Amino acid sequence: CGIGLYAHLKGKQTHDIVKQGLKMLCQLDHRGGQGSDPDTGDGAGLLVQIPDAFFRKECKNINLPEKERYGVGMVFFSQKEDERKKIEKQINALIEQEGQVVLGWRTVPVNVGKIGTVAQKSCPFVRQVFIGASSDLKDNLSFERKLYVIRKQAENWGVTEGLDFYFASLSSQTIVYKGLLTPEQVDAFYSDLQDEAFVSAFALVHSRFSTNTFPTWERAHPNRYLVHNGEINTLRGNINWMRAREQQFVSESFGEDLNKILPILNADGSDSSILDNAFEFFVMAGRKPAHTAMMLIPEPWTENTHMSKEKRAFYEYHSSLMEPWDGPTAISFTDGKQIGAILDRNGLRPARYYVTKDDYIIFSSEVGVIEVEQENVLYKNRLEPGKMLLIDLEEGRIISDEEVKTQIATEYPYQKWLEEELVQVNPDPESREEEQFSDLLTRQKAFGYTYEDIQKYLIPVIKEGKDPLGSMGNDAPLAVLSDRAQSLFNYFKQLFAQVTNPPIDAIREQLVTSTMTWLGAEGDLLHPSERNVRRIKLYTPVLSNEQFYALKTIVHPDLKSQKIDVLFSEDLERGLKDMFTQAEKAISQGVSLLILSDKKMNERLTPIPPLLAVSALHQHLIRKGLRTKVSIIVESGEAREVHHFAALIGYGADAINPYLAYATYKQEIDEGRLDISYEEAVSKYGKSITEGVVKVMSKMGISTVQSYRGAQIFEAVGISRDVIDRYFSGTASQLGGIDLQTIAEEAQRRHREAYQDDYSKTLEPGSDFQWRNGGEHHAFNPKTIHTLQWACRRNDYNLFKQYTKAADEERIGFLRNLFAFDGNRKPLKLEEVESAESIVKRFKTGAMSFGSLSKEAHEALAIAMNRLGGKSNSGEGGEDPKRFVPDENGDDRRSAIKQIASGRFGVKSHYLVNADELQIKMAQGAKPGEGGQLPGNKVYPWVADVRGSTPGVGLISPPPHHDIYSIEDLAQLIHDLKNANRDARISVKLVSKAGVGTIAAGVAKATADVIVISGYDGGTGASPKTSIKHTGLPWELGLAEAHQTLMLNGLRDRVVLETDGKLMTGRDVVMAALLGAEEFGFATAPLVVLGCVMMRACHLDTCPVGVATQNPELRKKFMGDPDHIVNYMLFIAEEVREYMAALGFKTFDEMIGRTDVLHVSERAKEHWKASQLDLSTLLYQPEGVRTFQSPQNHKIDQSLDITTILPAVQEAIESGKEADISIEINNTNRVAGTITGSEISKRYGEEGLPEDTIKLHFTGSAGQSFGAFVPKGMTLYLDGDSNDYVGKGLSGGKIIVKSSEGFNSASDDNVIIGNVAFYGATSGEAYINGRAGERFAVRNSGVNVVVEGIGDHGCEYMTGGSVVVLGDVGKNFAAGMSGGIAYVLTEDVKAFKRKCNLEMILFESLEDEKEIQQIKAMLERHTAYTNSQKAEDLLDQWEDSVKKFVKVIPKNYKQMLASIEEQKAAGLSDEEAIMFAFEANTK
Amino acid sequence: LDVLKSTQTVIHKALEKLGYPEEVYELLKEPMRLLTVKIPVRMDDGSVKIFTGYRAQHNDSVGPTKGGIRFHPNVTEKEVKALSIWMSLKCGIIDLPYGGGKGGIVCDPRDMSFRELERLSRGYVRAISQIVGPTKDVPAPDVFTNSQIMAWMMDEYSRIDEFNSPGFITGKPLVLGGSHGRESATAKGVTICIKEAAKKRGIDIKGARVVVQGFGNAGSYLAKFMHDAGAKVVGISDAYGGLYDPEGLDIDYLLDRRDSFGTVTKLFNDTITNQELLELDCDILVPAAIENQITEENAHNIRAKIVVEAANGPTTLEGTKILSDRDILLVPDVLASAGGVTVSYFEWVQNNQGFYWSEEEVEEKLEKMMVKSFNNIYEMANNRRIDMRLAAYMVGVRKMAEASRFRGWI
């Protein structure tokens, strides 16, 4: 998986470059995984220039004109012939009517037998078509325009006919070969490639991963022009916006051909094909390829202070007319005579390229793709973010990005246009009026406010400056099942990114975010001038009362305003049609802003759900092709949560005016509460809501509000498919559900009750985040809680049965409660079924953070589960190594499931090797797309010591896995962990979601042994409240979809699904097993057994029962006992066995997957809305196998480690004697050392060996994740250049990286390491002889490193150690750095000041003699081990170097170090001094 | 409720300090021509609602009258008369040939629509066309009023008089015959006034510390002008907070990133409330934000040597007394915020002449007028031991009273 190109700059051509490109593809092959069989090709292809020599030599019956005056087509046909010749005639007719002369047709010979079975079965026919050029076509640009017109017309005719054929490419400078072929198979299949007549200038390539096991020849790229990497998270809003602008595109170059080319994009096409179509249209429109690429993929232009004014104006102008296309991507396009290469606005993929004395640029994903002469290599650079690697074959030079960008910016007076044409809407300060309705209570009840909602969501926002937190994630029944009337918002659940893309962070990565919003009407995109930018622009989506009134009162003729009453009486269809009529009438009149107002609403007129109204208006406008001419502002009372806000922006609303919330704040301030002033309160609320919207955006990964605005990132749960298609087209829904009539009835009921309200003047208490008697039902009610506790403490079975009955029946809690047994089968005696000891081995405790829990509770859980024989778990907070030895009494506190979270806090050689299985926390049920925060107050020394950080320092866990940028990286990490612990099983933790079946299939291909699907009902230590309530989906849908997709693809017999989340009863366990579960996880229930009372205050760290609090005073109140947990598990097992007797099932694998025994209960039909659900999706059993038998064969064998290193090093490791060896390593060898490190750690442990016991040498390019998990005492001399993730999870030892021996240029100035290095390491040394990549030392926690320059975001989340940069530094350095030191060398002090992020770092100059001596010793070792000229010169000029050095240290780290040093000097013990300093700091 | 009585009391104080008889006070306490009219209007639904109009000419002894028009739903006769007297005081202070006046309509532009506003303005002109003309009255932009309404009013007066009268109404669009710099007039006026005040008090403008709370168009243009002149800005505030940097704030970057509303605060960064912003060290303080900010509690905390009240009465009597005792120069708002009136007068002169000046000429004339007026008022306020507010009121009333005495109405 990846890309590649081998281009000759000066333009000279030979077959050698094509052969080298094929070799490059073959080498790149290793990154991908295995599908059904290794022979199948997941997708690959190659691109070249037109081979006129070969064509003239081979065709022999075409009078081929000169080089530039004809084009070559490539068409894929089915196996049949009648449709083939019909399409051939029709294409000839198209060409003839367009006026070009068809030269002829040709058939490409192919070797079918050289291909796997599936691709042989799907093998399509290939014919190349030659196009002529008329004398009128003077310019090749016009020729390409006509060819594009012909291709689009042919595609339109084909889709109208319904046939199945595809144009691979139709251009005069590019011909593309592709298919479901492995690279070793492509050359054999396309026998044309074997001829020695091809002469090309460049040769682009690409290999796909095929997340699903059912790809098609058409989908696989290289596409027509460009090769694409990663995924685009804005591909629904993208298509909607593009279709909207489609009807309004107008230009002169295409003339009337826009009518022919009306469909400009393939709706069914994938992200790469859609991007290629849009890019090709834009570049044919009359823009340069570089210009359109910059337009489509802009740099961060807002919030960035390192950009030139011309560039900032350029991007401000283009963002006003075209939205950005966010997501991990590495574009590499072509236009025949020019080439380019780009990374996304965040640079989430690697791209390292070479240059030689013969002008052979080698741009590829990794470094060692092909063998190159180190005596000829000239540059080893990296394509940094926001830098255009552009090549021009005719000129034969690498044109510099700086000058390309400068001249593009200066081509027009964008700065003057922005300065002049912007519209000012300065509000009048004397027009103030604090609005009041005098019906505040009535309106609040109508819109669904509650006193709980107010006092727990509005005041805390102002008090804390942020959204309030929580714990014990939502367990209330879905809105569709809840009997109480619920607003339409609850039916929509947010989404997030699991695989193929990371969840980007916001607070630390603020430079990438962009919250600029444009209001008005866009102009002519193809010929834009000043009317695209004569528009209003906002900083935040939310608005204040004064701002909203100013917008409404603006009377400028170009920017008009209209108010549309979004209300209805009886017929929702009539209301929506009337609203459409007002909208279209206003557009015809010429308005540009629409105001959807819920005001003026009385007992006879009720409000449409604002989400539904906005979605309907947006869809109608997009369909009629007028959305670009208007701006939809929304003023709805029911807008007070970040969830509601984000839903409105995502589904179309231009701005929100929470007038009801503002009036509520006015009332509270008048009463006396919330003493802060009204204006300050309004501003704080707006800022907090904008921050929440940014957080919700960061959850998914869309970093631009403009992109998210079009993007529809919600998944309706309980809305009918017909309604979704009508109004929410593109949204994903599984069960269908309620209808428009039901929604109208619900709204009318709520409105009528609220406007009746003739008994009291108070708001009924809410029950969303707390339980109040008579309110919304919750899974854990006090009845269930104390019944369970009493039964567990008494060991009585009748009480437990009563608890199960109460928990299950009497209400509708979850989807699984709608399933019932047929009841007509053959019961079997309880003594004939599998036993409880066999039952209990398939249970888990779920991840339990040591910081969140107390030591007593955690050890009780571990002891109980280990005694029972299941598999306990350890949270992301690591674990004290003292728990790896059983106690004298026989207790075993060791955790069988070691979790590898984003923090990588306790990851170490010992911590990983002493385990039984490994999980990868891709996400949790509550806060999937978010990280965490553990401030100084809550981080105690007894937690910091375990987590390997300084006491009393606020730790930050980044949301994404910085080692996971795609499924390929996920597979690489899985292989790394398997190599680290060969004797363990790898696991992944997912969350139910749309497409989770596809993600599970991709993971299974990535060779993850166990997949865990966790519903959003699961708990959490801390998370934002809206993330608690409106994130994820119930695990039932996720498990059903994953099982169906896996067993359809054929990989269900290679993985072991699991389940967790509110598994409170053996009925729930049986439901999960029938749905396809194998092992289960119980986390919330064991806490209740231990003594938790579901108080929902874990985040507060003030547990009254002392179950989730670190305070010793509260810990003294603990009363738990492992016997209670054992009794709970035994009772669950016995109840499950009783149901097994009832159902007549003999064994687990025998029952599993037998969903035919499930039918809907009559209670669902009785329910007034739950009866409208479609359950056939879950009740469906395709043929296949339904149990794990195969061993999930890994590729641990044949690795360089086992082959060469270990066989001569067993004696050294066992005898503790020194040994030296030299090895040749190529890029295929991935890890190269983790196995030896694991062996050393297992044999000895944390202590390791004496310094420099094993001295491994290496040569040539290294593989990805080289030298990961290396323990202390090892030393890896790598005399070459490496790939990403160097020294991942280091736990001691040295790593010396020096450029090749034949390389004589500035190795200290040429990059020698990949993006991320030393991620999550704990202690060690390093000496890198060159620049590093983006995000260097992401989570260094004790490793001292020496580098000559680093990329961007370097030293992001350090918590210790030190860094010594001998050169420049990228922007946003030390972003969130909460600990450690960074002696960054620099010359331009002020430029360094500007580059660094000033939030949480303090700068100094070296004055301490000990610091100076430490730096001197580090540089001395660096020179002694590397022979670096920069280091030698610095040692020589030490006198100037000490002055020129710059030191960086966080405030809290500095203060804590000073305090602990003062205490130690005073002469107090280490523990007492640490405690006293922590108390003083966090009083 | 107390606006009219307060205006009468300050006028009485100024007249007493001048020493003129009580006849001038009797004549000037009340506007000489107040007209109340009812304007029929047709709504979109077809129903007809009647809006109550207003118009007041405080005096016309000097020459043609002038006044704004506010579509404020709480406009009343007392407020209209008070605003007419206030505008007359502005004209007298700036030494213009205007007498003073004000108009208004009782309506709600919020619920009102575009075509309905058009019809409302047109009916208003049809109603009050009799007592309004080039030598009798001159409307101008004001609260809930702008260039489109000015253009509609001009078009209709052209229709009713049968001949083009571009000089009939000011604040017109540029194409219709407007004047350049109509948006930066207040900023230019405050810039001239701050420069002259610093010169008179000896504070060097070069390197002077400045704070500008309230970052609308006035604040943005004032900051840009200060940066161009040389003075450093060490504080800005808006509806979302403020900032602080003793060594500049990159006003160029702030203006480049300036949005439609003028909001500039970051998202994930703490901000400084205006209450603490006022206390920050600075040479000159420029409150151009919500009124009633400087009071007794913060009077002892203020530190600026020069305070300019660009807003309308942001301070109170107690704060004024405390500042005077502390010897802190206090620029009256009447002189601080006269740039709009001055540019409107220049626009009227340009229309009457039929030839349009340029930005440089407008700049020079406006600065000349402002510096002359400020120097005159400063000299008078130092000659007579009084507060600058009293000096402003006295100077403004002097011209009106003396012109009335010449014309012989008294």
Ligand SMILES: Cc1cc2nc3c(=O)[nH]c(=O)nc-3n(C[C@H](O)[C@H](O)[C@H](O)COP(=O)(O)O)c2cc1C
């Ligand atoms: C207090 C608490 C803390 C949790 N902490 C984590 C965590 O740190 N990481 C994680 O992946 N899951 C965490 N979980 C979720 C569980 O480990 C598990 O994945 C699942 O959600 C439990 O489902 P259950 O409520 O049915 O027991 C936590 C759950 C609770 C209740």
Ligand code: F3S
């Ligand atoms: S919800 Fe948390 S605060 Fe204690 S009572 Fe339960 S562990």
